[PDB]
């Protein structure tokens, strides 16, 4: 299991850190997510990484990449992104892990 655990969590044990905000430059778990981001909506004028909007059906689409899908994971954010992102340098320096012919 290559999943980064929530590095700013007090709890001992502690948790792991599933989502991560861009608009904080920092990865954290929903708990901490939460404290961090208080109730405002529609986001709290904070971006994220594929985040989980009311839509629901099967799969996440990326922030603003309709025309490429999330298809890799990054390990420093401990989320899924797209290859598209990985490619414009988004995510060129984080180790994130592909398929493999
Ligand atoms: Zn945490
Ligand atoms: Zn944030
Ligand atoms: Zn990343
Ligand atoms: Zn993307």
Redesign the pocket.
Known sequence: AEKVLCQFCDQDPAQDAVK?CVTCEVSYCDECLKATHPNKKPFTGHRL?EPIPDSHIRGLMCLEHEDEKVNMY????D?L?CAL?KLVG??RD?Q?AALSE
């Open positions: 991560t990484i990054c390990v420093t954010d989320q992104i992102c988004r995510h984080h994130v």
